[PDB]
Design a binder for this molecule. Sequence first.
Ligand code: HH8
Ligand code: CL
Length: 130
Amino acid sequence: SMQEEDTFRELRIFLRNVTHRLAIDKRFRVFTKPVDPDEVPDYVTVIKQPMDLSSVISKIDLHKYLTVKDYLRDIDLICSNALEYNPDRDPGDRLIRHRACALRDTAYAIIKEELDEDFEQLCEEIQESR
Ligand SMILES: Brc1ccnc2ncccc12
Ligand SMILES: [Cl-]
């Protein structure tokens, strides 16, 4: 209907605002762009599911997120990818891992404080019923 359209627009607006708040945080500057294949020519071979905040924005705007659950799966990728590609004890790796998973914990904490559970449930029930 347009009730349903109104629901998904509100979701998109909410997901944009969360994604913007992550993207202007200095800690996360490295996650605002896909990994450059110049700097890292083995990344896009090793990391099957590249994910970054600019990609998340594109998916919001292409209506690929019908639930916060779907959105958080992509946020989880930004962290799990960082852990997978940068596992070493050296500070370079430890810093990207720390940041990647602080991005994850920030997104979860924002959504925990600001997402109405009943709004997520409505989104889930519309999605399941399609
Ligand atoms: Br730059 C860079 C190098 C290594 N791993 C990375 N993981 C995620 C984002 C950027 C990365
Ligand atoms: Cl830096």
